[PDB]
Amino acid sequence: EKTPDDVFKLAKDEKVEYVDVRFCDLPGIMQHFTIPASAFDKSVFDDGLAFDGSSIRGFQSIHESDMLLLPDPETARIDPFRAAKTLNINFFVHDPFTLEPYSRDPRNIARKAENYLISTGIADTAYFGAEAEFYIFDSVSFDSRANGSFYEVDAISGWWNTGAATEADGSPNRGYKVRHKGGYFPVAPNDQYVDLRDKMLTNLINSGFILEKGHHEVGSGGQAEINYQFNSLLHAADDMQLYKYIIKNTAWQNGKTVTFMPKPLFGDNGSGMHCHQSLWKDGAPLMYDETGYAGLSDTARHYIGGLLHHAPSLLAFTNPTVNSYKRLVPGYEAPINLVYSQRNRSACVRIPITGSNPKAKRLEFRSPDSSGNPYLAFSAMLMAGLDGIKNKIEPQAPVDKDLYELPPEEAASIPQTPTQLSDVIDRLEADHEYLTEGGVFTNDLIETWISFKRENEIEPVNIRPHPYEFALYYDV
Amino acid sequence: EKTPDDVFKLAKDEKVEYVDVRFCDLPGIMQHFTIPASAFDKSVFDDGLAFDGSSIRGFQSIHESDMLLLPDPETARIDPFRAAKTLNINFFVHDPFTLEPYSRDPRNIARKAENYLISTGIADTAYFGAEAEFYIFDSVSFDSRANGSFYEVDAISGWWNTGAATEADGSPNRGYKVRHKGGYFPVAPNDQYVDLRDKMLTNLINSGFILEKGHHEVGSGGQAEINYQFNSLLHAADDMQLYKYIIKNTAWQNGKTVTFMPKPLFGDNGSGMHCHQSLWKDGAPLMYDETGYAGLSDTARHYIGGLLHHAPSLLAFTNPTVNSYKRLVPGYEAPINLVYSQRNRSACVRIPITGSNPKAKRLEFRSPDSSGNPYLAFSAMLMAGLDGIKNKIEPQAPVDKDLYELPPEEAASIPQTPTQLSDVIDRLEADHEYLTEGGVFTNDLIETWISFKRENEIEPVNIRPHPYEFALYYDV
Amino acid sequence: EKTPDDVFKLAKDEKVEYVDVRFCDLPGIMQHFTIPASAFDKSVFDDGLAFDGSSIRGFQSIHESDMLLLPDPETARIDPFRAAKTLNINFFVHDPFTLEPYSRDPRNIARKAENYLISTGIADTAYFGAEAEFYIFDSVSFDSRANGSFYEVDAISGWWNTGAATEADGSPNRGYKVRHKGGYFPVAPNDQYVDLRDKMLTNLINSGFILEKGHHEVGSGGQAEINYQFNSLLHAADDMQLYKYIIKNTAWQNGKTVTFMPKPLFGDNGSGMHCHQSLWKDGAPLMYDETGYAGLSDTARHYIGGLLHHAPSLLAFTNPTVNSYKRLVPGYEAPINLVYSQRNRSACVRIPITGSNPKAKRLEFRSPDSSGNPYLAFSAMLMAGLDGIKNKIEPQAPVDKDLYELPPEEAASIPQTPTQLSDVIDRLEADHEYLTEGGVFTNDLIETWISFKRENEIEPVNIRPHPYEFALYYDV
Amino acid sequence: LHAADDMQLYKYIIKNTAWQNGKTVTFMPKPLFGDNGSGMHCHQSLWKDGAPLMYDETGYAGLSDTARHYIGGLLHHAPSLLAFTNPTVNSYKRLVPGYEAPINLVYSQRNRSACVRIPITGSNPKAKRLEFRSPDSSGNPYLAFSAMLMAGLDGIKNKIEPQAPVDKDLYELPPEEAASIPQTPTQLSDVIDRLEADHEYLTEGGVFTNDLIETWISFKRENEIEPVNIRPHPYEFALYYDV
Numbered sequence A, B, C: 001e002k003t004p005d006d007v008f009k010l011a012k013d014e015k016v017e018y019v020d021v022r023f024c025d026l027p028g029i030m031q032h033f034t035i036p037a038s039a040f041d042k043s044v045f046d047d048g049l050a051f052d053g054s055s056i057r058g059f060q061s062i063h064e065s066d067m068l069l070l071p072d073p074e075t076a077r078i079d080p081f082r083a084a085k086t087l088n089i090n091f092f093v094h095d096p097f098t099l100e101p102y103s104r105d106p107r108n109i110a111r112k113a114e115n116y117l118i119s120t121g122i123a124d125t126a127y128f129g130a131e132a133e134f135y136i137f138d139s140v141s142f143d144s145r146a147n148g149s150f151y152e153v154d155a156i157s158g159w160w161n162t163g164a165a166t167e168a169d170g171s172p173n174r175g176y177k178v179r180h181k182g183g184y185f186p187v188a189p190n191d192q193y194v195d196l197r198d199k200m201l202t203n204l205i206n207s208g209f210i211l212e213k214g215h216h217e218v219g220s221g222g223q224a225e226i227n228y229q230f231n232s233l234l235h236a237a238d239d240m241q242l243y244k245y246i247i248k249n250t251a252w253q254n255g256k257t258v259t260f261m262p263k264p265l266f267g268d269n270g271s272g273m274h275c276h277q278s279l280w281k282d283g284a285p286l287m288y289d290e291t292g293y294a295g296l297s298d299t300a301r302h303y304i305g306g307l308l309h310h311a312p313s314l315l316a317f318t319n320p321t322v323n324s325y326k327r328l329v330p331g332y333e334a335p336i337n338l339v340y341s342q343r344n345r346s347a348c349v350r351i352p353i354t355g356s357n358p359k360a361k362r363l364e365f366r367s368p369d370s371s372g373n374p375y376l377a378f379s380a381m382l383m384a385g386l387d388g389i390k391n392k393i394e395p396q397a398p399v400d401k402d403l404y405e406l407p408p409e410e411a412a413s414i415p416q417t418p419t420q421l422s423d424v425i426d427r428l429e430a431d432h433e434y435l436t437e438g439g440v441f442t443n444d445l446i447e448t449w450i451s452f453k454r455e456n457e458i459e460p461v462n463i464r465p466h467p468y469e470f471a472l473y474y475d476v
Numbered sequence D: 001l002h003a004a005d006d007m008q009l010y011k012y013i014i015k016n017t018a019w020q021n022g023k024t025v026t027f028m029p030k031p032l033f034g035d036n037g038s039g040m041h042c043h044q045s046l047w048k049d050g051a052p053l054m055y056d057e058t059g060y061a062g063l064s065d066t067a068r069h070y071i072g073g074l075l076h077h078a079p080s081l082l083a084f085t086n087p088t089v090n091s092y093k094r095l096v097p098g099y100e101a102p103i104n105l106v107y108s109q110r111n112r113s114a115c116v117r118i119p120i121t122g123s124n125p126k127a128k129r130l131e132f133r134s135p136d137s138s139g140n141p142y143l144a145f146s147a148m149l150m151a152g153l154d155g156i157k158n159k160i161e162p163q164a165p166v167d168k169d170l171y172e173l174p175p176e177e178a179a180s181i182p183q184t185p186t187q188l189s190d191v192i193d194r195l196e197a198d199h200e201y202l203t204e205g206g207v208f209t210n211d212l213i214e215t216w217i218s219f220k221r222e223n224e225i226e227p228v229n230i231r232p233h234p235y236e237f238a239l240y241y242d243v
């Protein structure tokens, strides 16, 4: 409930030199420009500020370029990195003529989703808790040419380096490198990132995050995870974007490089963005029933029914990259089919063991990753869950087994996760009505998304020969 | 019509030291072992020779390993490369108990296809003329690891080398390199492979090939093509396998390395295997009608109808690799949709301009490549064409335009070529009855093929991150 | 007057293994493919041979690709370079349906030009003598990237190398390098290319050229010139193409690299293609009049009038590249304005001093270079000259001065040569009627030429920053 | 004048902050091939007695007659005006389609592909202005600002009407629609030639004199146009080595 004057006071008290104006592009990267403290006045709140909509992905064409920005005082935070004292604020994108909210502003979609939820009477609050895992690498390089292509990531703790004569700077190999699938979570010196993760935890604390934990993750070569307290949809998506900024730049300032890509390593764990979800109304929880499987109420079970039913199109917003589908393979604690199960890290929806406290009851949607847009992803998940409640969609029976080790004939009788991005985009195009309910998603957004993924991602990868095709086929 | 005694005479006259026993594996690579001249006797013809069927792809399991081979005297040729005088002969694979022909011997499939054609009364001879294009490279390297993957091909004439300070051996850069899409076909010194191609042409002539032409092809970095006289199905497939052997080894002996892979270069022409086809009966041609479009008879037009109708599954045998589908992209004289058209190198079936001579009338099926098995590919094409004649399948009207430059709304009303290998394999699995006619293809062959491609090709590429995913997604 | 049977006899007597089928693309590079001797029969003369017209510049589109070739027995010569005995023959391009000559075959244009000349009654023979100068370099490299671009040529005799510690192979610098503008023409060891030019002279003699001289030219870094006997238009253009092939490949086989580009060196002489021209009728010369300036008849003077009047558009075919206009600068024995003058190497047309022999009387058109198509260039020159005779166009008075030393106010009073390629192309577009007389050039040819130069040459150079722009402007 | 003085000092401060911090800055129009050039867009407005003159609620893009005629002058005089606003050989490598720089002489509101864009500023009359997108930083801001003003003033004085605004992506216009629109000049030699032929609007009131104009023309020809013209381009070797 922060006000314009609250932000002006914060700026004065902190002796801010610059204000960094931020907003979200369609794919999911934050955009920014800087104004001096002297130019940060009431006119910023009253009239807004302009930018070139044609240079932003999924936004405007060149002849309709000018767009407008209006501040969100809830999102004002001091930047931990800039030597000149800087205040970061997120903005909403508006039409420069009518001052109406932009149909392709991701932050608007989240706003609309929250208001639609209230309008259904089902609940008044949707809580999102997320676990954005990442890799702390030392280096990366890659190219793509007519006659060749390559990539390489590297990290001191990568198992591929056990036989190295020296480290990259010429210093001795001192062992204690992380085995593949072996990073979760031995003490130092096996864990070579303790001090860096502490700096990440501290930078988050100093940016107003309420912290829960930090640890090394399963993957070799510096996989990590940090958890902060859940929040309502829009706040949670704003938290995600700032979290990624703080992780990436703490690493950068300390000589490292971070990636949130779903699957940077072949034959080791990918990086997921599990989303814990619950609905509340009038300050009371709605997910709990002592007599249901895994202690779940009807509302909760139908929300799951919606998620698993809509998955074939929903993944276009929750798993939105070509790389996403290299993670959805068996053996790495990511989903390979559409089942819910308690305590089950091989499942698509896991129900965490929380006991008899009704407040703690929730579902963990394990399918999503961090390769896209949290505003759009959280919103799409909500729309799928709500369609499930409204149409009382029953999920198929929980399967309490290692889903990777299912016998072939039982495995076949269960719907699989989509194989590739082109499949989920096709399915989104064919069936997206649940998303357009209440105008939360509009057709122009959905069509822009489909077009962007095909032209900029699917096709560019499809036309380029893969290095493994040379391993397979050079001698045909 | 060569006999056992004809081959024994050839071996004696040529003072042969060794006999190289050859046969075809299922994917399409020739296999061999050597016996001394003293061990080449009538018993080889009467009893045959044994091998380990479990070490050959698409053949036997380990407990049913032993298999038998019986010579085909038509295929006896002197090897141009071995210092010790060697006679090469192709063999048919047989069951070691019953002496029945093997259901998964590619050379048997071709045999069966030819006999089935005769049994239909439609014709007695199917002629296949093929153009197997290739690249004459200088080097290749590639790998696939947990944290990285690469490939690189290289050639002195590659345009990517115009700015090189020196050649690979340290000698000066002397220019005259080939522009992308610019290799067809300037005189030397632009054409840096004239003498090598002459050696290829001579080695073919000395192996009993009847030669027609040789030239540099469109692609930079040493693309080439050589044409030899067409023949009946089985002979033509045998010719193809020996041709590839002679091309590869002439190159090898002269310090080069050749690939027949469909698309080794990104942004330059792929290498195709166009198949010219015609049916004959009682020594008379069946493809010609003065009054048809492009001078085609009903029999010819229905054969085309069969090819274009069955394409979605047929390509599993004619375009059988993951790399195949990197070639089926617009702008490189390869098909992108299922149309026939005269004079048209952008089409799926081109009708060459041959004039009023009825003997010369034929179709050019431009879709196939050299990345698989010519015995299986020629056979499958025939089966599709015959199903077309038998069911009088009418092809959709010819389109006499640049098919790459079609307006979006006309382009959509035409069936496209398949996007990827997994699609054609799926389609083969669902619909393959035309192939099983007369038992030419059997279900065990089709099921083995589908299984091999999924487990050994489709899945291995799908699980491995592509270098371009790092270009697109590292900073998500 | 060679016949098909004359060529068959030559092939048999020389024990030819291969026949190289050659034809000219529109810009001016010879194209080829090879057939075995066994495939060289009467059918080649009767039916011709096919090729892909869509892969040849200025020819066909992809849907109308098939084209036909018919041999010219006058052009059969033994190849001096190929280890396998080869006979080269030039072909005419024909329509594959109607067998009519192709409107965009350069060799057809020359054919038509010769026949048109006869039809005018003016003369029956146009003689062309050409001097194609060239550089014998050691190496060349160049590229063009987003952030940088370079070229470098090199030669042992280049003056830029006088201070080199060693030669490229590590051997000592032994001096005797050529000074800029100092190559014409000191004895060896200053002249470092005597033996190589002797090899060029011998290869030409053995290919049926009648030789006149060879020498080093003005430019440092191995400039050279060889002269062979003049001939009638078509024969002369065929001679030029073969001469360029023999020069380039003699160099290549001897460790060097040759360029015919107009201006490879900045601040030293360009390479021209001076064209000596005369008209004859009934075996009698037409250029001579004892009483005319420089001994020229009215016919000759009007031919010159035509050349100088039509120059602004004519240079589109005689000086057809962007690089052409780097040579048309003062101080290097190339034209900078449109004057004729006897004995004058600074003029556009020089009249060589030949004495009172009427047979030797001729004009030297000094403007043309070797960067395009001799068939088109010779033809266009003839058409301009004939328009001059027909309309009795009077050239402006001869100027017997060093045209590089004129003060700027006096320079201005004479029409200048065009500054850049875009200007001559524009002018060709606006005025080309003299070329279309008798259908020698057709509109489709002229329009294709204009389009090719704009899209493939003019525009690509215009959009790319020049290195010297960085010298001038980095610090603006 | 103050604005031109500001420009010069700004360039000094940018270049030397970079220098002191291990970097190197260029203001050249097109240092990268296949990526955006660097422009110097000039927003312009006329005021009198402390009141704005560019605004009319009823005009297209909210422009008064004075403003529209100023634009008429800019687009009419462009063929010679660019000699002072786009004064280098490199300037014309930026004037190519696809990079938010002009390729023809149109004005249009909200349009970053246009020669003059009218920024969206609302109903406040004080904020009303034109953005002349053609100029770059490769020359002289004193001369460039002055020449723009002289062109705009000739437009007002002779009430020169600009051709109708075109509200489209101007790089994507169909063949014959684009062909009815005057293009921007191709190269420096063309604008210098045109300046030589027609420069009367500049000499009004003796703001520019003939000795200045003649010195400018002479300098560009001898020191820039000719030195580039005589030097072979690396791409000529890519195109022509094997002719």
Ligand SMILES: Cn1c(N2CCOCC2)nc2c1c(=O)n(Cc1ccc(Cl)c(Cl)c1)c(=O)n2C
Residues within 6 Å of the ligand: A127, A128, A129, A130, A131, A212, A227, A228, A229, A230, A276, A277, A278, A359, A360, A361, A362
């Ligand atoms: C621990 N947690 C996480 N974290 C799991 C670990 O990673 C951080 C998010 N996400 C949660 C929860 C979580 O506890 N709940 C339930 C919930 C919701 C509202 C209230 Cl007032 C209360 Cl007291 C509890 C939730 O509804 N969500 C979404």
Ligand SMILES: Cn1c(N2CCOCC2)nc2c1c(=O)n(Cc1ccc(Cl)c(Cl)c1)c(=O)n2C
Residues within 6 Å of the ligand: B127, B128, B129, B130, B131, B212, B227, B228, B229, B230, B276, B277, B278, B359, B360, B361, B362
């Ligand atoms: C020239 N050609 C090629 N070549 C095209 C160029 O590459 C080599 C194959 N393939 C052909 C043909 C080809 O001509 N024919 C027709 C054919 C068939 C049988 C006879 Cl007896 C005769 Cl005389 C002609 C055909 O039926 N096929 C299949």
Ligand SMILES: Cn1c(N2CCOCC2)nc2c1c(=O)n(Cc1ccc(Cl)c(Cl)c1)c(=O)n2C
Residues within 6 Å of the ligand: C127, C128, C129, C130, C131, C212, C227, C228, C229, C230, C276, C277, C278, C359, C360, C361, C362
């Ligand atoms: C020496 N020369 C050269 N060469 C000049 C030096 O380089 C080689 C060409 N070109 C000539 C001439 C040349 O002499 N003539 C005149 C000419 C024409 C026909 C006859 Cl039958 C005779 Cl005998 C003389 C000509 O008409 N042309 C075109």
Ligand SMILES: C[S@](=O)(CC[C@H](N)C(=O)O)=NP(=O)(O)O
Residues within 6 Å of the ligand: A131, A133, A184, A218, A225, A269, A270, A271, A272, A273, A274, A327, A332, A333, A334, A345, A366
């Ligand atoms: C240990 S893990 O199960 C691993 C998740 C894996 N990285 C993935 O979702 O791809 N995550 P958590 O226990 O934090 O939910």
Ligand SMILES: C[S@](=O)(CC[C@H](N)C(=O)O)=NP(=O)(O)O
Residues within 6 Å of the ligand: B131, B133, B184, B218, B225, B269, B270, B271, B272, B273, B274, B327, B332, B333, B334, B345, B366, C052, C055
């Ligand atoms: C010149 S091309 O059209 C090129 C074919 C291309 N390489 C392909 O099929 O991929 N082949 P051809 O003219 O020999 O049939």
Ligand SMILES: C[S@](=O)(CC[C@H](N)C(=O)O)=NP(=O)(O)O
Residues within 6 Å of the ligand: C131, C133, C184, C218, C225, C269, C270, C271, C272, C273, C274, C327, C332, C333, C334, C345, C366
């Ligand atoms: C010595 S030169 O005058 C030099 C010509 C110069 N290379 C040119 O035309 O560019 N040629 P020639 O005397 O052979 O006619």
Ligand SMILES: C[S@](=O)(CC[C@H](N)C(=O)O)=NP(=O)(O)O
Residues within 6 Å of the ligand: A052, A055, D036, D037, D038, D039, D040, D041, D094, D099, D100, D101, D112, D133
């Ligand atoms: C984003 S841009 O449109 C880019 C302009 C480009 N650099 C040019 O004018 O060349 N500039 P702005 O939005 O600052 O006016």
Ligand SMILES: [Cl-]
Residues within 6 Å of the ligand: A322, A420, A421, A422, A423, A458
């Ligand atoms: Cl995909």
Ligand SMILES: [Cl-]
Residues within 6 Å of the ligand: B322, B420, B421, B422, B423, B458
């Ligand atoms: Cl696939």
Ligand SMILES: [Cl-]
Residues within 6 Å of the ligand: C322, C420, C421, C422, C423, C458
């Ligand atoms: Cl030009």
Ligand SMILES: [Cl-]
Residues within 6 Å of the ligand: D089, D187, D188, D189, D190, D225
């Ligand atoms: Cl210029």
Ligand SMILES: [Mg+2]
Residues within 6 Å of the ligand: A131, A225
């Ligand atoms: Mg966790």
Ligand SMILES: [Mg+2]
Residues within 6 Å of the ligand: A131, A133, A217, A225
């Ligand atoms: Mg985790």
Ligand SMILES: [Mg+2]
Residues within 6 Å of the ligand: A131, A274, A364
């Ligand atoms: Mg989790």
Ligand SMILES: [Mg+2]
Residues within 6 Å of the ligand: B131, B225
């Ligand atoms: Mg061919």
Ligand SMILES: [Mg+2]
Residues within 6 Å of the ligand: B131, B133, B217, B225
């Ligand atoms: Mg080919």
